[PDB]
Design a protein around this motif. Structure first.
Motif, PDB file in Angstrom:
ATOM      1  N   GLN A   1      45.981  86.913  21.687  1.00 60.40           N
ATOM      2  CA  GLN A   1      44.852  87.848  21.660  1.00 60.40           C
ATOM      3  C   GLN A   1      45.038  89.049  22.597  1.00 60.40           C
ATOM      4  O   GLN A   1      44.935  90.189  22.154  1.00 60.40           O
ATOM      5  N   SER A   2      45.307  88.792  23.879  1.00 64.26           N
ATOM      6  CA  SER A   2      45.454  89.880  24.860  1.00 64.26           C
ATOM      7  C   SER A   2      46.697  90.725  24.645  1.00 64.26           C
ATOM      8  O   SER A   2      46.673  91.925  24.903  1.00 64.26           O
TER       9      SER A   2
ATOM     10  N   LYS B   1      45.093  94.231  24.041  1.00 63.31           N
ATOM     11  CA  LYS B   1      45.002  94.859  25.344  1.00 63.31           C
ATOM     12  C   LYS B   1      46.333  95.488  25.798  1.00 63.31           C
ATOM     13  O   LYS B   1      46.348  96.659  26.201  1.00 63.31           O
TER      14      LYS B   1
END
Length: 153
Positions: free
Chosen positions: A91-92, A96
């Motif tokens: 996810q990160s 991100k």
């Protein structure tokens, strides 16, 4: 997948890592950054570090190395049923930080190099091969998640 014996060899050498997670983390990151300086551009707080001497003396960097190897350890210990630990990392790294799979390959090699350097007695031919497969499975499952997450990856 990996045999029970392959996972045993992965976990045995990871035992050596956990006896000094900070020093290992620091050496892996240094190997990555010196071998592949483009990877350092991904780190706002580290990319001012120009030399190995500077990297070694960085406490931020050693802290992040622990972070990285701690998360990887948690995944490795799950031995192939690591969905839950892998999920927030994919996810990160997909939203991100945007870490290309190629960079994960570089860090895999850096880990294998450091492990061969520091623990050759716990990291012979079979064990190096088992760890190779283990990190391959990590990258493969990260990639599959990247795809769902809309990052290529």
């Amino acid at each position: 997948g990996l045999s029970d014996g392959e996972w045993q060899q992965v976990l045995n050498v990871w035992g050596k890592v956990e006896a000094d997670i900070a020093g290992h983390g620091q050496e892996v990151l240094i190997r990555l950054f010196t071998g592949h300086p483009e990877t350092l551009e991904k780190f706002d707080k580290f990319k001012h570090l120009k030399t190995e001497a500077e990297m070694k003396a960085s406490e931020d960097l050693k802290k992040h190395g622990t972070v990285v190897l701690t998360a990887l350890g948690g995944i490795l210990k799950k031995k192939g049923h690591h969905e839950a630990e892998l999920k927030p990392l994919a996810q990160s790294h997909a939203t991100k930080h945007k870490i290309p799979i190629k960079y994960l390959e570089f860090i895999s090699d850096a880990i294998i190099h450091v492990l061969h350097s520091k623990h050759p007695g716990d990291f012979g031919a079979d064990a190096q091969g088992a760890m190779t497969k283990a990190l391959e499975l990590f990258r493969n499952d990260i990639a599959a998640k990247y795809k769902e997450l809309g990052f290529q990856g």
